[PDB]
Design a binder for this molecule. Structure first.
Ligand SMILES: Nc1ncnc2c1ncn2[C@@H]1O[C@H](COP(=O)(O)O)[C@@H](O)[C@H]1O
Ligand SMILES: Nc1ncnc2c1ncn2[C@@H]1O[C@H](COP(=O)(O)O)[C@@H](O)[C@H]1O
Ligand SMILES: Nc1ncnc2c1ncn2[C@@H]1O[C@H](COP(=O)(O)O)[C@@H](O)[C@H]1O
Ligand SMILES: Nc1ncnc2c1ncn2[C@@H]1O[C@H](COP(=O)(O)O)[C@@H](O)[C@H]1O
Ligand SMILES: O=P(O)(O)OC[C@H]1O[C@](O)(COP(=O)(O)O)[C@@H](O)[C@@H]1O
Ligand SMILES: O=P(O)(O)OC[C@H]1O[C@](O)(COP(=O)(O)O)[C@@H](O)[C@@H]1O
Ligand SMILES: O=P(O)(O)OC[C@H]1O[C@](O)(COP(=O)(O)O)[C@@H](O)[C@@H]1O
Ligand SMILES: O=P(O)(O)OC[C@H]1O[C@](O)(COP(=O)(O)O)[C@@H](O)[C@@H]1O
Lengths: 418, 423, 423, 417
């Protein structure tokens, strides 16, 4: 019988088990043998077939019949990446040939998909399922990556508790939403929860963000709320703001120190604490006004939540579509769903010609959806800065003259799209 | 004086009603409008007494709505009071709207609500009042582009998945079959959504039956075939979800058996009272007679009103926010006698005529597309006997053995089901 | 060879069974013990066939139990199979336990499960096998100390509170009365727990009725008086919680009316089939006749099986972890024929015979203490007519007018209810 | 009719609205007029009756009839404290007399109760009667053992759910999470979450024998657990740390905690216990393939909707506060003991050494604490004497058995066993 091998790569997302169960159950009805590689490509990269065998399990009906209820992944995951070295690429092929895998399904994000194709270019069929809580794969605009609905809904619930706490005990929370690729998750939680402000890298006009601009954008929102009798709120910040910051901005971000670096010289953005740094600066400027500021991260607690019904149906249909692609002879394709139809889409169609890697889908800040979400935020627009009565009220809330306020804040209209 | 926006809700509640109310109100307050809300839909506007209406209208202020997007239900309540039947009531509604100087009138409800709003507007000048309605249904039965949901449906489906999950664990921990009856007779979107998400072993919706009228025996045998096939694989437990809409497709003879071989209950006007029907209960009793000897236990369970006012999930909070905004945008752009709908990621007004089915005079009913790939995928992960299964002599031998009958008897009784439901 | 601990579950499932199983297994594994679990309680141990028992026993390993403390249900399932009625079955259980060389035998279940365990032990040498039982019930009807709840009760009550919360929002958003029927016929602990937490406008439990037999009319009138009093304050909606145990206290005449003026159903051996009774449904039908004209709509709703396998709340996660440890502690300390209970924050074994009520021979049943401060406080936040309320003529006039009847007529019909339930 | 005034002080806890609704609904049935002061004592301290009126609301049946479902407090809360100045105390006295408050209910912590009694001690006992309801999510009131403060049950169960997701994520993507449970008073909340979720280790200040904790000891305690699980093939886990560990640390330990810098001063809030431990442990164990990430579980618990246990608890408390007033009680705290809500004079609950209500901490000698410790991964005294176990654990850390015993064995004298 043909052998289907399944692995997960990247960060976990709710519904991984849904894909594994959808593909495996259907594959078992066809008589296929199904196996699962533990921790993604980590052991397939070694090239040692003995080690790989110690880290594969037989995916049986009893194993998968009820994992569609469960967050996380029963075969675990890793970011082990064979595409970096041709030596590692041949190791992955050597172990797959040794195990006589006829069909190879990888469940992961953009990094995982690019890894799959390198193994595929040289019998064996390679298909990948789109996974990310950041929603940054190049799916059709009216289509989400699986795990995003679950992550967004749980993020909304957490932010609701912070909204009740901020009003009950007046305070501002700076929530730092995990994910640096795009702002889909940060904007999603903020819009659903009615958060008073959301900042994503996609809305900054210039290529490089300055630390002062970010501080002042949050400051303007806090003051305008203060002019309307509200000394509390919630502000959501995409962690991706850090990856757009200039060299100078990162220096201030890390405490006016040199940014930490890995052995190769790349900055270590994980050590950055965007929300905590902004909270300290803002307390210095606004504490006297009766404002309290506390940072809060909404990250890893979203990744392995049990899937919501939308992701349960999505991943069941995706797992089926992966098997159907195998039966119909497809290879080097991504299973995507558009207009209620799961279809394979060749890898090449999704590559960005400039990069050679899977294209990254960001928030379209020109869309109607972004404009409606922006309406329900507290912020100063171009028209607001031109309203002399409004500028007077806000400036007074910040205990500064209107001329001082316009000098400091009016330039932000050229920093972010309006 | 600032323009007055009046908002009411009609029909049954759906999660996210407060989302529409807050979305419309908050944007309107930023424009300087005065916003008021009628309690219980048209109930008091039908009286025509302006004294009574004011006692049951409230000022929808920033403080009232700034945080109702978290909450299920509707803070201005709802009713099915329907003025369209009488112009005495319609003119009473007109008299109160004019007294309160309502410039913009937003109704959130089903067709009965939408039709009432347009009828009240037709006997009014277009300059004086502009009328917009937002279509609401938890049944997902509006004619949106395929695989695009009505607001409130996602929340109802996800909560239904959670309830069925607890029943799936309970059926396995203490072997038993649950017949879950999903509320709603319009369509089978909700029953199928819960079933697919929870991995339920069977779902029956009226949309999959080929013939125009369903027979009570066939429904029993379709569930019976699933229970036997599961029993033949060592599983004497499961969960089967039944859309309540099965009752509305049943023949006269089928309804006679459904109500205990009695005459179906009737209202004063003579129309059948299908609400008194207990589909899951009757099927459970009959199946216990046939399968009790095999060690099978069967219990019914309804999943209804606990879904209607659950707090909205993030998808519905965003959905209703865009709808509330889009209605105000429609008012600003001069639209009236229009329905605020979201299609292809865009909230737009849609004239009533485009959505009406001429046969009924009400909005067309979108049912489950049983030819769609989604329905076929859902059917794959169910336990059932297909055309190919009945031709498999080895499989038929095991299932018949589980039912303590010969293979010939089983094929004779059940094989005809392949002509009853699409395959 | 290491000693063998064998575990089974009996009775109905309750949240935290996996918690007890994981507590006992993990600690037992650290001691070097071998742990096995019998599937479906006593079902296969009663056969006496060691081949059948082995086909339905599993090895409880670290990987199997390391994280089941999060999960509702039981990984080894449960059953109500009861060997205690027959010595033939008791000896069969002994034969299979000796064959599997069970040194320690832990049963997790209710009264019947504990009683079966002791009977199996009386004909067994105290040096070969030691038997311990862990008390489980969602009905909270075991005779634990008054300051202690049974495990699973906290989870069932909190989820029950949430479901009723959605019904409270739905009843107010769309004016209606829900008659919620709380599962469990032993006592009213679960119904009163859900009602008080959710602010339900009324709770009726068997424990509050003075007379030994309840009358169907009295139940209808108690709900009728509440609906009218609420109506006298402008509220035509609410939620009323009914312990299913009301049915098991009803007289013969009351049961005849309960089953539709039909003969009550009976099983083959003569036991009335109270499961088939639908208390909330029947009360709704009668109340709609009397109160429909007033604009009152009534709908029943059952809150049953969806609570039994919910994931445990933290209180039950800690409780069942301490119980599983406490069962292992009892085994190590030479205890047998004892039940592991927690009192004043201390887990200790308590001999089964010490917990028996000498008048009956069974474990005493703890019901709601209606004289306690807790019950009086719960009654305060209900809508009802007290003794003094019936004497307040201003109030009685307002309520009677809401009911379309004279004040004298109201007193005639309802005033006697102060002699039906404790005040 | 008599006037009952209610205010909230301190940090919010789930069920605050439950107390407000219990007291208000019962008082309305008695015919009382009920008002609520916004943000605790903040505006009563000014003494301006015009300002206070702008920040008091009429607590009516419609306002409170359904707030028992809701987290937070509808009248908000503050830490404004009039007891510090006799000038502020008059101001509170002047505004309460102006509003003709007969009954005064304060819902808050120890500071809130002390303010209420202080305002009452210099006021005629006939005009005003004062009761306080003790609130804390830290479970540190001196109730009978194994009896909780309201809000603790809700906070613990939601914290369990958060940790569960981290437990799945740590296993799905091998990693260690150092969760820092908010609260410096005690370890009730950290240990409650840890036991319920099956977390592999929990550290509370109460388990350290010496009076001052050393930063090195904390690192090594977490290090030993990571190695012992690693010796059983598991390079992942979750460890819960009570924030109270920092307030027990020595001066030298705090110096290392803040990055070998001078600790900030007016400041334990600025300390990042979980983050600092994460950095040090990565230095020592990163080479072994271990990743460590901190996570704080704080403010998201404070205003969660109450669980059923807290909804009943706060309803019974609100009833008891009204019952105490009717029976003439004043300068008393409404507490529940043996399932009975009754008033207890504030002075009866004070520990003479401090002048504030006594603090109940985790009893590490109790059976409950030992059972929780059993299901943790750690090296006991007996474990260090098991040569086979020490050899495997040391090998997992790529160090000799002698080196492992040299570095870690002394920890059995650092924490109770
Ligand atoms: N930036 C903003 N975002 C959302 N609402 C706002 C904003 N600024 C003012 N509002 C609200 O808009 C309404 C009208 O404000 P105004 O134009 O100042 O009278 C009030 O309800 C304000 O709270
Ligand atoms: N009706 C069904 N729906 C879903 N899975 C099934 C069904 N019938 C059999 N299976 C599974 O399909 C696989 C192959 O079955 P078989 O045809 O007996 O080899 C096994 O894992 C069965 O449990
Ligand atoms: N049976 C009841 N349970 C709870 N609250 C009530 C009840 N009856 C009246 N109330 C409330 O008690 C307050 C005073 O009642 P009354 O003095 O009768 O108007 C009002 O808020 C009523 O809604
Ligand atoms: N520190 C610990 N905490 C909890 N369980 C443990 C610990 N150490 C060992 N175990 C478990 O105890 C059982 C017996 O261990 P061993 O004595 O090493 O065979 C196995 O299930 C281990 O995983
Ligand atoms: O697993 P790590 O290395 O700690 O990184 C977490 C990152 O993974 C994510 O959770 C999602 O990972 P993917 O991009 O692979 O879906 C991001 O939000 C986050 O930046
Ligand atoms: O409110 P009623 O009269 O009891 O009717 C219940 C109906 O409301 C619903 O739950 C939802 O109604 P809507 O489509 O108007 O949202 C239906 O499923 C059901 O038919
Ligand atoms: O398993 P069955 O026969 O459906 O019985 C359901 C009964 O079990 C329970 O859920 C609990 O039963 P136990 O007391 O044995 O735990 C009751 O509430 C209910 O009456
Ligand atoms: O409100 P702050 O100043 O940010 O401090 C939060 C503190 O309040 C609490 O949530 C509890 O407050 P109380 O002690 O008043 O009950 C602690 O857990 C926490 O240390």
């Amino acid at each position: 019988a043909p052998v289907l091998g399944i692995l997960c790569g990247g960060g976990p997302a709710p519904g991984l088990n849904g894909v594994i169960a959808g593909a495996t159950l259907y594959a078992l009805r066809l008589g296929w043998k199904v196996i699962g590689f533990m921790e993604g490509f980590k052991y397939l990269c070694t090239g040692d077939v003995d080690v790989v065998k110690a880290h594969t399990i037989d995916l049986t009906y009893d194993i998968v019949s009820r994992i569609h209820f469960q967050g996380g992944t029963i075969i675990q995951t890793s970011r082990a990446n064979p595409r970096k070295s041709p030596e590692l690429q041949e190791n992955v092929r050597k172990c797959l040939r040794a195990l006589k895998v006829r069909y190879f399904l990888t469940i992961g994000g953009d990094d995982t998909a690019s890894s799959a194709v390198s193994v595929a270019s040289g019998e064996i069929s390679v298909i990948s399922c789109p996974k990310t809580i950041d929603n940054d794969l190049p799916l059709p605009a009216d289509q989400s990556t699986f795990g995003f609905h679950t992550a967004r809904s749980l993020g909304m619930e957490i932010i609701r508790n912070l909204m009740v706490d901020s009003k009950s005990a007046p305070r501002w929370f700076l929530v730092e939403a995990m994910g640096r690729s795009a702002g889909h998750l940060a904007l999603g939680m903020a819009e659903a929860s009615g958060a008073h402000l959301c900042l994503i890298p996609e809305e900054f006009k210039q290529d490089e963000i300055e630390f002062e601009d970010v501080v002042e954008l949050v400051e303007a929102t806090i003051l305008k709320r203060l002019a309307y009798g509200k000394n509390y709120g919630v502000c959501v910040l995409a962690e991706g703001l850090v990856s757009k910051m200039s060299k100078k901005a990162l220096y201030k971000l890390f405490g006016n120190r040199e940014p930490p670096t890995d052995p190769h010289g790349h900055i270590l953005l994980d050590d950055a604490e965007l929300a905590r740094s902004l909270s300290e600066e803002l307390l210095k400027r606004l504490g006297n006004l009766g404002i309290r500021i506390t940072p809060k991260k909404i990250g890893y607690e979203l990744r392995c939540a049990d899937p919501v019904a939308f992701d349960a149906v999505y991943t069941r249909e995706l797992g089926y579509g992966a098997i159907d692609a195998f039966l119909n002879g497809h290879s080097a394709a991504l299973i995507v769903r558009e207009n209620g139809q799961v279809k394979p889409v060749q890898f090449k169609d999704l590559l960005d010609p400039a990069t050679g890697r899977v294209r990254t889908r960001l928030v379209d800040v020109t869309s109607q959806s972004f404009k409606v979400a922006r309406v329900y935020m507290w912020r100063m627009s171009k028209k607001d800065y031109e309203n002399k009565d409004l500028v007077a009220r806000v400036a007074a809330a910040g205990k500064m003259t209107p001329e001082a306020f316009t000098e400091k804040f009016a330039h932000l209209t050229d920093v972010v799209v309006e």
